[PDB]
Design a protein around this ligand. Sequence first.
Ligand SMILES: COc1cc(C(=O)NC2CCN(C)CC2)ccc1Nc1ncc2c(n1)N(C1CCCC1)CC(F)(F)C(=O)N2C
Length: 122
Amino acid sequence: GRVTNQLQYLHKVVMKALWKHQFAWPFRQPVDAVKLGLPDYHKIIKQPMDMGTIKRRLENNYYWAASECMQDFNTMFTNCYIYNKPTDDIVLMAQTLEKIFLQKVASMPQEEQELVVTIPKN
Ligand SMILES: COc1cc(C(=O)NC2CCN(C)CC2)ccc1Nc1ncc2c(n1)N(C1CCCC1)CC(F)(F)C(=O)N2C
């Protein structure tokens, strides 16, 4: 992957804010559907995603574009709304985190640029 202004902002502003939120802990690691007794979880949710995975990907420069990172966040939230019950607090926790995510994306640099300056050689 690579480092862009938007990806660096996602890592050290957006993820920084979301990871330490009071509601973050259910989303810091993948759903353990075996331990939690949810053997329909992976039947219903085709793309599991969590902030621990996203954070590791940001740390390892896995993403090529901010859009891929934003789609992982988006999928994480949507998974929660699709699987759980409308009245579960976990849904309201996801909704709270997603509102912060959106507000941070609003303030992200507008145009993605790779963080690179090269001296012409050859
Ligand atoms: C092992 O970690 C947990 C442990 C306990 C746990 O053991 N809680 C008990 C601790 C002791 N008291 C006495 C009772 C609850 C509860 C939840 C845990 N973790 C978790 N992570 C993610 C999700 C989730 N849960 N959701 C919740 C909804 C309600 C039941 C799972 C369902 C979900 F579908 F997987 C989902 O979408 N998300 C986002």
